[PDB]
Amino acid sequence: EKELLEEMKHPSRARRAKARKRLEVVRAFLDSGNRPEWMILEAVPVLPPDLRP
Amino acid sequence: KGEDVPEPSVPESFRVLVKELQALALDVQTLDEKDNPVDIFEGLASK
Amino acid sequence: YDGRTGEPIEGPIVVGQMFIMKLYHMVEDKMHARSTGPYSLITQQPLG
DNA sequence: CTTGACAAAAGTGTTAAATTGTGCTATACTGGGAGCCGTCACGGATGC
DNA sequence: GCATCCGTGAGTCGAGGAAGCACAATTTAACACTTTTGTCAAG
Q: What is the DSSP string of B1-47?
A: -----------HHHHHHHHHHHTTT-----B-TTS-B--SSTTSS--
Q: What residue of B is the nearest CA neighbor of C44? A: B12
**Measuring CA to CA, which residue among B45, B42, B47, B35 is closest to residue B10?**
B42
- Considering only CB atoms, which chain A residues are within 8 Å of C41? 50, 53
Long-range CB pairs of C16-21, under 8 A, 24+ apart, other chains included: none
Residues A26-37: b if buried by 16+ CB within 10 A, e if exposed = eeeeeeeeeeee
| Determination technique used | cryo-EM
What CA–CA distance (Å, rounded) separates C18 from A3? 87
Decide: A7 and A19 in contact? Cβ < 8 Å.
Answer: yes
Strand partners, B31: B37
> Which residues in B7-42 are b (16+ Cβ under 10 Å) and which e?
eeeeeeeebbebbbeeeeeeeeeeeeeeeeeeeeee
Is any atom of strand E within 7 angstroms of residue C37's beta carbon? Answer: no
How far apart are alpha carbons B11 and B28 in whole angstroms? Answer: 16
Q: From CA A26, how far away is CA A32, in angstroms rounded?
A: 10
Protein-to-nucleotide distance from the CA of A24 to the C1' of E31, whole angstroms = 76
d(CA A45, CA B20): 10
Q: How many CB atoms lie within 10 A of CB A19?
A: 19
Q: How far apart are CA A2 and CA A11, in angstroms?
A: 18
